[PDB]
Amino acid sequence: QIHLVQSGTEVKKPGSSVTVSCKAYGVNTFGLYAVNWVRQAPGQSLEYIGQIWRWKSSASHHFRGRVLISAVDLTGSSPPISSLEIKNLTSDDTAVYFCTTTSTYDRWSGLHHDGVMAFSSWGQGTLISVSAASTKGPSVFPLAPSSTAALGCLVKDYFPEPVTVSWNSGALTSGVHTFPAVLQSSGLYSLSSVVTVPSSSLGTQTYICNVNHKPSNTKVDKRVEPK
Amino acid sequence: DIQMTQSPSTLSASTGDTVRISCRASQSITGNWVAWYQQRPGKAPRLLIYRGAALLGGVPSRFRGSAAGTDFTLTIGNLQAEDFGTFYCQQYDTYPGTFGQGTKVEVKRTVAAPSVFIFPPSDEQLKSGTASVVCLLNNFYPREAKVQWKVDNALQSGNSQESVTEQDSKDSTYSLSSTLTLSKADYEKHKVYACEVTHQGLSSPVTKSFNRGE
Amino acid sequence: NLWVTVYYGVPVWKDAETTLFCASDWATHACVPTDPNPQEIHLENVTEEFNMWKNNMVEQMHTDIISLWDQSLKPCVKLTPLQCTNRGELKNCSFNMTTELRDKKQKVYSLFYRLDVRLINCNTSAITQACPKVSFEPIPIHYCAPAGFAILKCKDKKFNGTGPCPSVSTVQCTHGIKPVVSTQLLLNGSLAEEEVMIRSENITNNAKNILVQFNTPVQINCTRPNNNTRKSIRIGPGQAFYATVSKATWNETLGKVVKQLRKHFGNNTIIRFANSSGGDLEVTTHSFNCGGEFFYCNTSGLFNSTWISNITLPCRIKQIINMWQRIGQAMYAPPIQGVIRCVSNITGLILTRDGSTTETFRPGGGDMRDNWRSELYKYKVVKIEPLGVAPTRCKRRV
Amino acid sequence: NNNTRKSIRIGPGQAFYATAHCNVSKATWNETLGKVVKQLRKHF
Amino acid sequence: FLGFLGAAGSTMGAASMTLTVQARNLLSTVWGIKQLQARVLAVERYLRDQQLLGIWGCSGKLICCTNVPWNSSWSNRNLSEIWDNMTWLQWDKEISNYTQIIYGLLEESQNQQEKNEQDLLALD
Amino acid sequence: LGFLGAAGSTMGAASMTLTVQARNLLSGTVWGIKQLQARVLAVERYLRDQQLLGIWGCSGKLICCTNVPWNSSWSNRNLSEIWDNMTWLQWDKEISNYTQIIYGLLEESQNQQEKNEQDLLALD
Ligand SMILES: *[C@@H]1O[C@H](CO)[C@@H](O[C@@H]2O[C@H](CO)[C@@H](O[C@@H]3O[C@H](CO[C@H]4O[C@H](CO[C@H]5O[C@H](CO)[C@@H](O)[C@H](O)[C@@H]5O[C@H]5O[C@H](CO)[C@@H](O)[C@H](O)[C@@H]5O)[C@@H](O)[C@H](O[C@H]5O[C@H](CO)[C@@H](O)[C@H](O)[C@@H]5O)[C@@H]4O)[C@@H](O)[C@H](O[C@H]4O[C@H](CO)[C@@H](O)[C@H](O)[C@@H]4O[C@H]4O[C@H](CO)[C@@H](O)[C@H](O)[C@@H]4O[C@H]4O[C@H](CO)[C@@H](O)[C@H](O)[C@@H]4O)[C@@H]3O)[C@H](O)[C@H]2NC(C)=O)[C@H](O)[C@H]1NC(C)=O
Ligand SMILES: *[C@@H]1O[C@H](CO)[C@@H](O[C@@H]2O[C@H](CO)[C@@H](O[C@@H]3O[C@H](CO[C@H]4O[C@H](CO)[C@@H](O)[C@H](O)[C@@H]4O)[C@@H](O)[C@H](O[C@H]4O[C@H](CO)[C@@H](O)[C@H](O)[C@@H]4O[C@H]4O[C@H](CO)[C@@H](O)[C@H](O)[C@@H]4O)[C@@H]3O)[C@H](O)[C@H]2NC(C)=O)[C@H](O)[C@H]1NC(C)=O
Ligand SMILES: *[C@@H]1O[C@H](CO)[C@@H](O[C@@H]2O[C@H](CO)[C@@H](O[C@@H]3O[C@H](CO[C@H]4O[C@H](CO)[C@@H](O)[C@H](O)[C@@H]4O)[C@@H](O)[C@H](O[C@H]4O[C@H](CO)[C@@H](O)[C@H](O)[C@@H]4O)[C@@H]3O)[C@H](O)[C@H]2NC(C)=O)[C@H](O)[C@H]1NC(C)=O
Ligand SMILES: *[C@@H]1O[C@H](CO)[C@@H](O[C@@H]2O[C@H](CO)[C@@H](O)[C@H](O)[C@H]2NC(C)=O)[C@H](O)[C@H]1NC(C)=O
Ligand SMILES: *[C@@H]1O[C@H](CO)[C@@H](O[C@@H]2O[C@H](CO)[C@@H](O)[C@H](O)[C@H]2NC(C)=O)[C@H](O)[C@H]1NC(C)=O
Ligand SMILES: *[C@@H]1O[C@H](CO)[C@@H](O[C@@H]2O[C@H](CO)[C@@H](O)[C@H](O)[C@H]2NC(C)=O)[C@H](O)[C@H]1NC(C)=O
Ligand SMILES: *[C@@H]1O[C@H](CO)[C@@H](O[C@@H]2O[C@H](CO)[C@@H](O)[C@H](O)[C@H]2NC(C)=O)[C@H](O)[C@H]1NC(C)=O
Ligand SMILES: *[C@@H]1O[C@H](CO)[C@@H](O)[C@H](O)[C@H]1NC(C)=O
Ligand SMILES: *[C@@H]1O[C@H](CO)[C@@H](O)[C@H](O)[C@H]1NC(C)=O
């Protein structure tokens, strides 16, 4: 079966370059399959960057000349692989980047139209984050209950994504809403994670959230005592 | 370039329903070089339909597409739980291939009033020199709702940010976070902090608030 | 104001599989002879993608050989009515044999090889001797496409059998393809121009065989140097049983193969050549027919090497064969009077691979379809679709 | 009956393979026959 | 004399100059039984194409003018976009959806309606 | 209305659907040899019918006008009677005596004298 695996997530600063790899397992050759690279901006629509078909590299006019897409055929050691290199990153390039494999053996397939084609195989995705900020552990502050009631944690000023939030070391899972990250004016990420529990259990049970940030290798445990 | 204008942007349906998503192109695509994709949040898109009426190997029979001139329609009869998500139309008649804005397919639920909570800034956060105010909206439907912040009974804008969960699989409700951030010196100066929420499920705008100190 | 118009003969073809007939300049007789000068038409600006691994021609050629060969033992004498001493490659076995008459019997002195012997055939299958009149001499065979079809040929000097072909031509008939039944070593096959090339259904997978094509041919002589004799013992009525490489050139070739292997396994890694690990005797040995007697020769003397980044072989004979793993059918080869000598060109290898920097390569075997693929890589069958409709702004006269 | 067959070797190659009421419902058959006899009708 | 399928990689306009080369080479005891049904298929493969050519008001080889107006929905391309910047292999791919529509429209399109009126017209 | 759809209709109405029986008139190891002779027979019965259309001035499918006068002795009838009150099966039986007279009359009275006429006529 065809499995497309891409490189790991990478953090880069503006003006830098970057090369993302894509191992095509199950693909027999790039002579009978074409590779298309598409990025999806955060919460946005998808955008065609380029392709490589019949061993011919190409890129869209918007990205024309700014990107280099190479691929190498199968070897006895490793399956065939394509590479998407993007020079001079900007914050508008922060997006997820996808590998595409579509069979090209048949002329009538209707998947492809003279090099312009639909996308039959896809990959896990590579998050390319472009920001001037450097890695930073999150400062965690408690959202305390007062006056059924709700409480939470405030995870603020962490870069890059992601942070994982758990409660009572995983004991508390019901009613837990961990909001997605927002990117601050300071080019930093911040989110909050809240819980709804019966107010009658506020003094009985103790509530702790567990934040972990592997990029900074930071892990904090913050007690949310009510006020 | 071809411009794919997708419609509608969001639709709600239930299991077993029959649902239709339209996608118009700036030019007319005779060759029917248009594909449809399903993307659940976080995972990679799946190619469902290519060339209009062609189903990709393994895609259920209940997905069928129709192409006439400029307009294109993806039809999902007998809507299933696995089918909910976001859908994109893609043309590949002229270089470069262009996708649509997308169409969100949410679950139907009875309209639900939001549980509103307001959270003042942590005392420890104050020793850092910054203050963040959070207003929580929880378990509500539908997703259209507007929050404004009232400080000393005065409107505040440009400094509030919002974050929203994806629809809960079990109750088909949403949850929203409104984070208001400002300087430490300004906070002590302001007299009182309030959160007023306007939503369909509430008869009149519900406002939940706190004055500095409790 | 534009209107449809019908065009006939428009150059439009699609991939297709169909029955192909034969062309031959005794099995070859009854096969429609070839045109004194074929026509080859180049397809300018045309790029066609080939997939030698999914070719129907090979499997139509393979199914043709199997089913045409059994017809070569149908009008031949059946050997159903069939004490030894000698190491000795052959053994002088005696046995009682029926004569013309059911009652009378006959004692006989015959000479069979150690591998044919009760004979091994009875445990597995019945047996039929070949007709001594027909010959197994390889003669070139052309495979042709009938009307409404065409065959595309990749006019590329270096081609691994897959991907796009920028220079395509078409012919009604393939070239004279040798159906030479050889194992491990390809004999009298197509010679690659300039650099040698390597082909495997899956390079990553070791289990898939690895076909090598020489550009420099390798001369090879084998000889059955004993003057044998034939006494036609009467096993009536009517039916009758007929009772009884250069080391200087090989390293030049191999030295090109390591360069041929190139980046497939890496430049740095060492390349080791080792004998086959085992299996059926048709795999372990460079088995082929020569002069009517079937040769089995050990190639361990060619495949013993360890190549850093920077010649006679033994031979034995089997009197009977069950080629193509066909059970129920067995052919006895009636020996030939006199000494046998052959001189053929080694044109390619079939190689397998093992499961750091250690690469082991063995001589090839298994399906004989791979050797046909050493000839049918340049070809694929297409169906001609000559009807076209298009607008031209002409209207029919009324 | 759970039978077992033993392949005795009448070679070469060839091999010979050496080595029960049946039921129908009656409630339907009486019903079926009565339609049959009426089906004959005029013929007899 | 560019040969059989010679103009395959050429534009549609130029490939219609060499039509008569792919049309003349369109018809061009066991074991031998496998060459027979190839001959047999060859003629039913050829009569099938010419029955259409017959049901359609053509028969006459190579080129044929019609009274079917090309609705735009089939292509919407200026003939220059088709004859001078496209090959037959590409064109057959675009219209693949509407081809059997055209085939049906042809026969009904004139001959059913066209041969009948000639019957009326040829009365007087 | 499909293949053989108008068998029970009047001759006048049955001639509208000629292209449905005409398009389905060719319809696009032992034991399998039984299916081979069938499709071999299929073409020689189709060509035998179309050889006549060839030596007749037809070629063009389905309907064809001629110059052979309809002789009174053969099925002298009201045109309205023939086409508005008769089926083809009925008609083929009534003209049955005079059919091969017409077949022979067609090949000679019409095309043999007509193309040699044109041969003489196209001299200037
Ligand atoms: C069976 O047989 C078959 C044939 O018999 C055989 O097929 C052959 O397959 C091989 C693959 O193994 C093919 O060779 C490959 O070709 C690839 C494509 O090469 C073309 O494209 C590149 C790039 O083109 C862009 O740039 C040029 C500028 O020069 C432009 O002019 C182009 O138009 C194009 O620009 C367009 O696209 C841009 C974006 O993509 C747009 O922005 C722009 O606007 C345009 O739209 C060209 O450079 C190539 O030209 C070069 O070579 C030709 C000669 O062929 C010269 O004439 C020319 O002047 C150039 O020198 C060509 O046009 C190559 O990408 C690929 O190269 C890789 O492999 C070699 C080793 O073999 C490396 O040295 C090389 O660096 C590449 O490796 C990179 O990628 C791998 C994997 O991705 C990485 O692991 C590796 O690290 C490396 O990355 C490095 O570079 C990156 C930057 O690129 C950097 O980010 C990395 O960090 C790292 O530093 C290879 O050569 C060959 O063509 C086939 N043969 C035929 C006949 O077609 C098949 O394999 C056989 N199969 C088997 C199983 O045996
Ligand atoms: C020619 O021969 C070569 C071998 O020489 C052969 O290459 C092999 O191809 C297969 C697929 O065709 C490859 O197998 C896949 O490998 C991926 C990735 O494996 C790496 O990463 C994992 C995780 O870190 C490691 O465990 C592993 O050791 C490797 O390092 C796997 O992810 C695949 O399994 C997934 O898919 C299966 C589908 O049936 C599931 O059952 C399974 O549970 C896995 O699912 C998970 O991952 C999915 C993403 O892959 C995800 O979508 C799911 O939701 C779930 O999370 C699969 O095993 C194999 O590695 C290749 N080996 C080599 C040496 O290349 C070629 O295929 C062959 N060529 C042809 C044409 O056949
Ligand atoms: C323009 O013209 C193109 C042709 O050029 C049309 O493309 C065809 O689209 C149809 C869509 O229905 C395709 O048919 C479907 O193919 C599916 C996949 O086929 C592949 O995989 C299977 C399984 O491995 C193989 O058997 C097959 O050979 C292919 O390799 C099938 O899965 C579909 O069948 C399923 O759905 C039906 C639903 O009724 C069930 O009844 C079946 O049992 C089964 O579950 C279906 O057959 C077809 O392959 C395409 N052809 C080509 C040549 O591309 C476009 O549709 C047309 N455009 C428009 C707008 O009409
Ligand atoms: C990377 O590309 C950006 C454009 O995306 C370049 O930014 C431009 O830089 C010039 C001067 O260098 C300015 O005049 C433009 O206004 C800039 N445009 C934008 C959109 O930023 C940038 O120069 C490039 N980086 C490098 C190192 O050359
Ligand atoms: C196989 O035998 C042939 C002879 O039939 C050898 O060819 C001879 O080679 C020598 C020199 O090697 C020449 O002098 C002779 O003129 C050649 N004769 C013929 C008829 O070709 C050949 O060398 C042998 N192969 C090997 C590997 O030794
Ligand atoms: C490969 O071709 C060679 C010819 O180059 C064949 O050698 C001939 O073999 C026949 C009998 O098999 C002899 O009658 C000829 O005298 C031989 N000619 C030469 C020049 O040696 C050889 O038989 C072929 N090999 C196979 C396996 O068919
Ligand atoms: C076709 O037959 C009808 C009879 O079915 C003929 O109609 C008769 O015509 C004559 C005068 O021409 C009248 O006097 C009769 O009264 C008519 N009878 C009926 C029943 O209509 C008709 O003439 C015939 N058609 C032709 C062209 O001769
Ligand atoms: C062709 O155009 C007509 C209008 O003249 C329209 O009814 C028809 O839908 C078009 N063809 C197709 C295949 O849609
Ligand atoms: C009319 O047909 C008959 C045959 O039925 C024929 O004998 C006769 O000659 C024909 N009439 C004339 C005027 O020739």
Short mmCIF file of N, CA and C in Angstrom, two decimals, chain B residues 89-176:
data_model
loop_
_atom_site.label_atom_id
_atom_site.label_comp_id
_atom_site.label_asym_id
_atom_site.label_seq_id
_atom_site.Cartn_x
_atom_site.Cartn_y
_atom_site.Cartn_z
N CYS B 89 -13.83 21.78 -3.01
CA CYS B 89 -13.79 21.51 -4.44
C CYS B 89 -12.47 22.02 -5.01
N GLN B 90 -11.91 21.26 -5.95
CA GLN B 90 -10.65 21.61 -6.59
C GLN B 90 -10.78 21.47 -8.09
N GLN B 91 -10.44 22.52 -8.82
CA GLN B 91 -10.37 22.45 -10.27
C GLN B 91 -8.93 22.18 -10.70
N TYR B 92 -8.78 21.51 -11.84
CA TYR B 92 -7.48 21.29 -12.45
C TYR B 92 -7.59 21.31 -13.97
N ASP B 93 -8.38 22.26 -14.48
CA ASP B 93 -8.52 22.48 -15.92
C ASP B 93 -7.44 23.40 -16.46
N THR B 94 -7.14 24.49 -15.75
CA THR B 94 -6.05 25.38 -16.09
C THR B 94 -5.03 25.40 -14.96
N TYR B 95 -3.76 25.52 -15.34
CA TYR B 95 -2.68 25.69 -14.38
C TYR B 95 -2.76 27.10 -13.79
N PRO B 96 -2.66 27.22 -12.46
CA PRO B 96 -2.50 26.13 -11.50
C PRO B 96 -3.83 25.62 -10.94
N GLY B 97 -3.84 24.40 -10.42
CA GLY B 97 -5.02 23.88 -9.77
C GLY B 97 -5.44 24.76 -8.61
N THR B 98 -6.73 25.08 -8.52
CA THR B 98 -7.22 25.95 -7.46
C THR B 98 -8.34 25.26 -6.69
N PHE B 99 -8.34 25.48 -5.38
CA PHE B 99 -9.34 24.93 -4.48
C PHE B 99 -10.38 25.99 -4.14
N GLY B 100 -11.47 25.54 -3.52
CA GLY B 100 -12.50 26.45 -3.07
C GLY B 100 -12.26 26.93 -1.65
N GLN B 101 -13.10 27.89 -1.24
CA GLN B 101 -13.04 28.37 0.14
C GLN B 101 -13.31 27.24 1.12
N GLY B 102 -14.13 26.27 0.74
CA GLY B 102 -14.49 25.17 1.60
C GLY B 102 -15.92 25.28 2.10
N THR B 103 -16.44 24.15 2.57
CA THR B 103 -17.79 24.07 3.11
C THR B 103 -17.78 23.22 4.37
N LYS B 104 -18.22 23.81 5.48
CA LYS B 104 -18.27 23.12 6.76
C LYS B 104 -19.62 22.44 6.94
N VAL B 105 -19.59 21.20 7.44
CA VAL B 105 -20.77 20.37 7.61
C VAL B 105 -20.86 20.02 9.09
N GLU B 106 -21.71 20.73 9.82
CA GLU B 106 -21.87 20.54 11.25
C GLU B 106 -23.11 19.71 11.55
N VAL B 107 -23.18 19.22 12.78
CA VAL B 107 -24.31 18.42 13.23
C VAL B 107 -25.45 19.34 13.66
N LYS B 108 -26.67 18.89 13.42
CA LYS B 108 -27.83 19.59 13.95
C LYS B 108 -27.96 19.30 15.44
N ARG B 109 -28.45 20.30 16.17
CA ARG B 109 -28.77 20.15 17.59
C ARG B 109 -29.81 21.20 17.92
N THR B 110 -30.57 20.95 18.98
CA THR B 110 -31.47 21.98 19.47
C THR B 110 -30.65 23.17 19.93
N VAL B 111 -31.18 24.38 19.70
CA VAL B 111 -30.44 25.58 20.08
C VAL B 111 -30.18 25.55 21.58
N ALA B 112 -28.98 25.99 21.97
CA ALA B 112 -28.51 25.84 23.34
C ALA B 112 -27.94 27.15 23.84
N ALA B 113 -28.44 27.60 24.99
CA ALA B 113 -27.92 28.81 25.61
C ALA B 113 -26.54 28.53 26.21
N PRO B 114 -25.64 29.51 26.16
CA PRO B 114 -24.28 29.30 26.67
C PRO B 114 -24.16 29.55 28.17
N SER B 115 -23.44 28.65 28.83
CA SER B 115 -23.02 28.91 30.20
C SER B 115 -21.91 29.95 30.19
N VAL B 116 -22.15 31.09 30.83
CA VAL B 116 -21.21 32.21 30.82
C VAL B 116 -20.48 32.25 32.16
N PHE B 117 -19.16 32.35 32.11
CA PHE B 117 -18.33 32.55 33.28
C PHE B 117 -17.32 33.65 32.99
N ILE B 118 -16.98 34.43 34.01
CA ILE B 118 -15.95 35.45 33.89
C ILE B 118 -14.85 35.14 34.90
N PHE B 119 -13.60 35.31 34.47
CA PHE B 119 -12.44 35.02 35.29
C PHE B 119 -11.56 36.25 35.40
N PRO B 120 -11.34 36.79 36.59
CA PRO B 120 -10.40 37.89 36.76
C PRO B 120 -8.97 37.39 36.63
N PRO B 121 -8.00 38.28 36.51
CA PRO B 121 -6.61 37.83 36.37
C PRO B 121 -6.08 37.24 37.66
N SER B 122 -5.17 36.28 37.51
CA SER B 122 -4.53 35.67 38.66
C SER B 122 -3.67 36.69 39.40
N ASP B 123 -3.67 36.61 40.73
CA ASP B 123 -2.78 37.46 41.52
C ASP B 123 -1.32 37.22 41.16
N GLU B 124 -0.96 35.96 40.90
CA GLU B 124 0.41 35.66 40.50
C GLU B 124 0.75 36.28 39.16
N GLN B 125 -0.21 36.27 38.22
CA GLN B 125 0.01 36.93 36.94
C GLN B 125 0.32 38.41 37.12
N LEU B 126 -0.21 39.02 38.17
CA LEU B 126 0.06 40.43 38.43
C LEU B 126 1.52 40.67 38.82
N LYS B 127 2.14 39.73 39.54
CA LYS B 127 3.55 39.86 39.87
C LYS B 127 4.45 39.71 38.65
N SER B 128 3.93 39.16 37.55
CA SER B 128 4.66 39.14 36.29
C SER B 128 4.58 40.48 35.57
N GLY B 129 3.65 41.35 35.94
CA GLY B 129 3.50 42.64 35.32
C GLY B 129 2.47 42.73 34.21
N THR B 130 1.69 41.67 33.98
CA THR B 130 0.66 41.66 32.95
C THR B 130 -0.62 41.10 33.55
N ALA B 131 -1.76 41.48 32.97
CA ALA B 131 -3.07 41.05 33.45
C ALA B 131 -3.91 40.57 32.28
N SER B 132 -4.50 39.39 32.42
CA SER B 132 -5.35 38.80 31.39
C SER B 132 -6.73 38.52 31.98
N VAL B 133 -7.77 38.92 31.26
CA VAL B 133 -9.16 38.69 31.66
C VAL B 133 -9.78 37.73 30.65
N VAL B 134 -10.50 36.72 31.16
CA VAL B 134 -11.08 35.67 30.34
C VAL B 134 -12.58 35.60 30.60
N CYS B 135 -13.35 35.50 29.52
CA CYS B 135 -14.78 35.23 29.58
C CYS B 135 -15.04 33.91 28.87
N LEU B 136 -15.72 32.99 29.56
CA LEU B 136 -15.94 31.64 29.06
C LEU B 136 -17.39 31.47 28.62
N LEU B 137 -17.56 30.96 27.40
CA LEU B 137 -18.86 30.55 26.87
C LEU B 137 -18.78 29.06 26.60
N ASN B 138 -19.71 28.29 27.18
CA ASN B 138 -19.58 26.84 27.17
C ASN B 138 -20.88 26.15 26.78
N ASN B 139 -20.75 25.06 26.02
CA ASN B 139 -21.86 24.17 25.67
C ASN B 139 -23.07 24.79 24.96
N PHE B 140 -22.82 25.59 23.92
CA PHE B 140 -23.86 26.38 23.29
C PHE B 140 -23.99 26.02 21.82
N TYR B 141 -25.14 26.36 21.26
CA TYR B 141 -25.45 26.14 19.85
C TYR B 141 -26.54 27.12 19.41
N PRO B 142 -26.40 27.70 18.21
CA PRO B 142 -25.32 27.49 17.25
C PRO B 142 -24.08 28.34 17.52
N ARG B 143 -23.08 28.21 16.65
CA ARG B 143 -21.76 28.78 16.90
C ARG B 143 -21.71 30.30 16.73
N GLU B 144 -22.73 30.92 16.15
CA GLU B 144 -22.72 32.36 15.96
C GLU B 144 -23.01 33.06 17.28
N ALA B 145 -22.03 33.81 17.78
CA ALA B 145 -22.17 34.54 19.04
C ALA B 145 -21.10 35.62 19.09
N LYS B 146 -21.44 36.75 19.71
CA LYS B 146 -20.56 37.91 19.77
C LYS B 146 -20.35 38.32 21.22
N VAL B 147 -19.10 38.60 21.57
CA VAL B 147 -18.75 39.07 22.91
C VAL B 147 -18.12 40.44 22.80
N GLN B 148 -18.47 41.32 23.73
CA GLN B 148 -17.82 42.61 23.89
C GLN B 148 -17.46 42.77 25.36
N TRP B 149 -16.38 43.50 25.62
CA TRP B 149 -15.88 43.74 26.97
C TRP B 149 -16.22 45.16 27.39
N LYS B 150 -16.75 45.31 28.60
CA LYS B 150 -17.13 46.61 29.16
C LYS B 150 -16.32 46.85 30.43
N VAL B 151 -15.43 47.84 30.39
CA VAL B 151 -14.57 48.19 31.51
C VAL B 151 -14.93 49.59 31.96
N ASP B 152 -15.24 49.74 33.25
CA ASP B 152 -15.79 50.99 33.78
C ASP B 152 -16.99 51.44 32.95
N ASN B 153 -17.79 50.46 32.52
CA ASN B 153 -19.00 50.69 31.71
C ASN B 153 -18.68 51.32 30.36
N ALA B 154 -17.46 51.11 29.86
CA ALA B 154 -17.04 51.65 28.57
C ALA B 154 -16.59 50.51 27.66
N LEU B 155 -16.91 50.64 26.37
CA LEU B 155 -16.56 49.62 25.39
C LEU B 155 -15.05 49.51 25.24
N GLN B 156 -14.59 48.31 24.87
CA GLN B 156 -13.18 48.01 24.71
C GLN B 156 -13.00 47.11 23.49
N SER B 157 -12.11 47.49 22.59
CA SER B 157 -11.88 46.72 21.38
C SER B 157 -10.42 46.83 20.97
N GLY B 158 -10.01 45.94 20.07
CA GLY B 158 -8.65 45.89 19.60
C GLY B 158 -7.69 45.11 20.48
N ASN B 159 -8.11 44.73 21.68
CA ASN B 159 -7.25 44.02 22.62
C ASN B 159 -7.85 42.70 23.08
N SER B 160 -8.93 42.24 22.45
CA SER B 160 -9.58 40.99 22.80
C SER B 160 -9.33 39.95 21.72
N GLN B 161 -9.07 38.71 22.14
CA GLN B 161 -8.86 37.60 21.23
C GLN B 161 -9.81 36.46 21.58
N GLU B 162 -10.10 35.62 20.59
CA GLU B 162 -11.07 34.55 20.74
C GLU B 162 -10.50 33.23 20.26
N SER B 163 -10.97 32.15 20.88
CA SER B 163 -10.56 30.79 20.57
C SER B 163 -11.76 29.88 20.78
N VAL B 164 -11.96 28.93 19.87
CA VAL B 164 -13.18 28.12 19.84
C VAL B 164 -12.83 26.65 19.66
N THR B 165 -13.48 25.80 20.44
CA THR B 165 -13.37 24.36 20.26
C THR B 165 -14.10 23.92 19.00
N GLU B 166 -13.78 22.72 18.54
CA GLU B 166 -14.59 22.08 17.52
C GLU B 166 -15.78 21.39 18.18
N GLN B 167 -16.82 21.15 17.37
CA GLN B 167 -18.09 20.67 17.89
C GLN B 167 -17.92 19.38 18.69
N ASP B 168 -18.57 19.33 19.85
CA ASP B 168 -18.49 18.16 20.71
C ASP B 168 -19.23 16.99 20.06
N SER B 169 -18.57 15.84 20.00
CA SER B 169 -19.16 14.69 19.32
C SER B 169 -20.42 14.19 20.02
N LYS B 170 -20.50 14.34 21.34
CA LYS B 170 -21.59 13.73 22.11
C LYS B 170 -22.83 14.61 22.18
N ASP B 171 -22.66 15.91 22.44
CA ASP B 171 -23.80 16.81 22.60
C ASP B 171 -24.02 17.73 21.42
N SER B 172 -23.07 17.81 20.48
CA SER B 172 -23.16 18.69 19.32
C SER B 172 -23.21 20.16 19.73
N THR B 173 -22.48 20.51 20.78
CA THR B 173 -22.37 21.89 21.24
C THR B 173 -20.93 22.37 21.12
N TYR B 174 -20.76 23.69 21.20
CA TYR B 174 -19.47 24.35 21.05
C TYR B 174 -19.09 25.03 22.36
N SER B 175 -17.86 25.56 22.39
CA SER B 175 -17.35 26.28 23.55
C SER B 175 -16.34 27.32 23.08
N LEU B 176 -16.35 28.50 23.72
CA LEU B 176 -15.55 29.62 23.25
C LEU B 176 -14.83 30.31 24.41
#
